[PDB]
């Protein structure tokens, strides 16, 4: 999509040479923000095919507060294998923090429910936040949250949301992230009888890996097709009762996919 | 300044009517981002006089990990009286979280030192973050952090920083916030032998109180004067050894100040 391709280009033009923890070089910029009107359609990148299946199962997994890849495996979803240990444990990552942020006094806050209450009983609140950045359990995590902070906003029956991605692989991870959170916005709005507003994406260290240049130029040459339409076949009793089948993407006609290898 | 006045205007033009917890109406927009090249000068609003004194003492106070207003009082700084209790306690706010984020296992993480180590020993890290958003101690706080998440970034000997302000009073609080964090960038860079890069400001619910319209239009009519220059008279042995006198703003010739009343 336009906003996306615009970023991709910007990174090429303005990105400074920076290396990552693996030794692979990246082109990076710091601080960027793009908006996506959700009424204009589901922000699923078209200039390259994306498989929403993994996306959906991962989101549902998070909402379950599960941090073991078992569920993912039952559905043959392996995007988390790379990090899980022999038992399939990733540590207190996303899911754990969202649904059971542990306090120093023995409690476990359910940030998702907390957020739902607010959207329903105090929509003008300015602190409708979900944070995965738990300083206390960083070490125990398989890896630090790429996207670790998001805020919800209500105005005119429209529910918006801003995500802050402190670190971002523009080519491989960004497309996935945008769709994932966009889907979360819809689920939230559905349970709150609210219309979807804007999904605002903000990033810190936004980069492209040096060995992704050709794929970038190749995609950067395709023309964005119209955005598809996300439809929810039903209205679960809660934000925790959605099932894979409830979602159906409609009108998605992407260009072919583009493989993006990684060094190890 | 330009970026600032541009926001002020945008809020007037595009802001939607929203009410706050006190009942006072605000004009608000969601999601905004402005950049400030720190080499161009210290971002201290000129179209209206700002007293940096309070700013500095508050920053130093934070770095001390102190959450009692006593220190502020010794210097006759009352910006926190409104919230402090009879003992002058504000709860586990900013200072406490920055210097002693409490873990569930009895520890207290020093996010400021943590961050300093990283900038000195692993500058390419993408997780150089400081968070005041401790879900565990929200209730015990005098009020929730307006600005609760910031990231540091290094590239070409230039240290940048992005702050995310989930809630923002454009007229009263924003100017104060920008200068405060800009000063922190400089202190950081000084202790890391790095040059200052960009201070990137991102906001969630960015608003103007309905009863600040005249002041807004009045300021919105002034022309930005050149930015002053921030100078540090010395190099303390650590980020915790700065004293009020070490800072000197130079070339600051602002327009007159503008009072901004608040309802209660």
**Domain-by-domain residue ranges, chain B?**
2-264
Q: Inter-chain contact A202–B151, Cβ cutoff 8 Å?
A: no
Q: Inter-chain contact A202–B30, Cβ cutoff 8 Å?
A: no
Q: Show residues of chain B in contact with A25, CB under 8 Å.
A: none
Chain B: give the shortest CA distance to residue A45, in Å: 22
Q: Show residues of chain B in contact with A141, CB under 8 Å.
A: none
In 3-state terms, what secondary structure has residue B138?
A: coil
Rounded Cα gap, residues B85 and A3, in angstroms: 48
Chain B: give the shortest CA distance to residue A11, in Å: 14
Most B CBs within 10 A among A107, A118, A204, A206, hence the mutation to make, goes to: A204
Active-site residues of A, by number, are: 146
Q: Inter-chain contact A30–B135, Cβ cutoff 8 Å?
A: no
Q: How far is CA B153 from CA A11, A117, A128, A210, A246, in A?
A: 16, 35, 27, 19, 41
Resolution (A): 2.9
A137: nearest CA in chain B?
B103
The residues pairing with A163 across neighbouring beta strands, listed in sequence order, are A150, A201
Chain A: give the shortest CA distance to residue B64, in Å: 19
The answer to whether A137 and A130 have CB atoms below 8 angstroms apart is no
| Elucidated via | X-ray
Q: Show residues of chain B in contact with A200, CB under 8 Å.
A: 30-31
Question: Shortest CA distance to B162 belongs to which of B131, B122, B134, B135?
Answer: B131
Phi-psi region of B251 (alpha: psi -120 to 50; beta: other; left: phi over 0): left
Chain B: give the shortest CA distance to residue A256, in Å: 31
Q: Inter-chain contact A129–B133, Cβ cutoff 8 Å?
A: yes
Nearest to B101 among A19, A31, A136 (CB): A136
| CATH code for the domain defined by A2-264 | 3.30.572.10
Buried b (16+ CB within 10 A) or exposed e, B187-223: bbbbbbebebbbbbbbbbbbbbbeebeebbeebeeee
Work out whether strand B147-155 and strand B129-131 pair parallel, antiparallel, or are unpaired: antiparallel
Two structure tokens written together for B243: 């004293």
Nearest to A103 among B16, B104, B204 (CB): B104
The answer to whether B141 and B176 have CB atoms below 8 angstroms apart is no
Nearest to B153 among A30, A127, A160 (CB): A30
The answer to whether A178 and A202 have CB atoms below 8 angstroms apart is no
Q: Cα(first)–Cα(last) distance of chain B, in Å?
A: 30
Most A CBs within 10 A among B21, B204, B210, hence the mutation to make, goes to: B204
Q: Show residues of chain A in contact with B101, CB under 8 Å.
A: 135-136
Residue with tokens 């005098």: B142
| Phi, psi (deg, nearest 5) at residue A76 | 50, 55
Q: Inter-chain contact B166–A104, Cβ cutoff 8 Å?
A: no
Question: Shortest CA distance to B106 belongs to which of A100, A108, A105?
Answer: A105
How many residues are there in chain B? Answer: 264
Chain A: give the shortest CA distance to residue B255, in Å: 31
A160: nearest CA in chain B?
B30
Question: Shortest CA distance to A144 belongs to which of A205, A77, A72, A202?
Answer: A205
Helix axes B52-63, B173-191, angle to 10 degrees: 50
Q: Which helix (H) or strand (E) holds B112?
A: helix B111-121
How many other CB atoms sit within 10 Å of the CB of residue B127? 19
The answer to whether A187 and A246 have CB atoms below 8 angstroms apart is no
Taking one residue from A and the other from B, the number of pairs with CB-CB distance under 8 angstroms is 137
Q: Inter-chain contact A166–B105, Cβ cutoff 8 Å?
A: no
Q: Inter-chain contact A135–B135, Cβ cutoff 8 Å?
A: no
Q: Show residues of chain B in contact with A126, CB under 8 Å.
A: 20, 166-167, 204-205
**Catalytic residue chosen out of the listed positions B146, B161, B168, B192:** B146
Q: Inter-chain contact B103–A105, Cβ cutoff 8 Å?
A: no
Chain B: give the shortest CA distance to residue A35, in Å: 8
Q: Inter-chain contact B133–A136, Cβ cutoff 8 Å?
A: no
C-alpha torsion angle, residues B240, B139, B208, A149 (rounded to 10): 70
Q: Inter-chain contact A101–B136, Cβ cutoff 8 Å?
A: yes
C-alpha torsion angle, residues A16, A17, A21, A22 (rounded to 10): 140
Does the annotation count B192 as an active-site position?
no
| Phi, psi (deg, nearest 5) at residue B231 | -130, 140
The answer to whether A10 and A26 have CB atoms below 8 angstroms apart is no
The answer to whether B172 and B190 have CB atoms below 8 angstroms apart is no
The residues pairing with A167 across neighbouring beta strands, listed in sequence order, are A205
B130: nearest CA in chain A?
A135
- Strand intervals (E) in A91-157: 101-102, 108-109, 129-131, 147-155
Q: Inter-chain contact B135–A109, Cβ cutoff 8 Å?
A: yes
């Amino acid at each position: 999509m336009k906003q996306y391709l615009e970023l991709m280009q910007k990174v090429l033009d303005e990105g400074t040479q920076k290396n990552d923890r693996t030794g692979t070089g990246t082109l990076s910029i710091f601080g960027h923000q793009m908006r996506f009107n959700l009424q204009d359609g589901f922000p699923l990148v078209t200039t390259k095919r994306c498989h929403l299946r993994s996306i959906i199962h991962e989101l549902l997994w998070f909402l379950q507060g599960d941090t073991n890849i078992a569920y993912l495996h039952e559905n043959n979803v392996t995007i988390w294998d790379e990090w899980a240990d022999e038992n399939g444990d990733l540590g207190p990552v996303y899911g754990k923090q969202w649904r059971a942020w542990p306090t120093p006094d023995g409690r476990h806050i359910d940030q998702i429910t907390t957020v739902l209450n607010q959207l329903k009983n105090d929509p003008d609140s300015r602190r409708i936040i979900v944070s995965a950045w738990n300083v206390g359990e960083l070490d125990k995590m398989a890896l630090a949250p790429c996207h670790a902070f998001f805020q919800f906003y209500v105005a005119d029956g429209k529910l918006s949301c801003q995500l802050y991605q402190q670190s971002c692989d523009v080519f491989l991870g960004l497309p996935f992230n945008i769709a994932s959170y966009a889907l979360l916005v819809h689920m939230m709005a559905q349970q709150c009888d609210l219309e979807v507003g804007d999904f605002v994406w903000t990033g810190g260290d936004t980069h492209l890996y040096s060995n992704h240049m050709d794929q970038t130029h190749l995609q950067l040459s395709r023309e964005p097709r119209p955005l598809p339409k996300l439809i929810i076949k039903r209205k679960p009793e809660s934000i925790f009762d959605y099932r894979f089948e409830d979602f159906e993407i409609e009108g998605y006609d992407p260009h072919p996919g583009i493989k993006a290898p990684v060094a190890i």
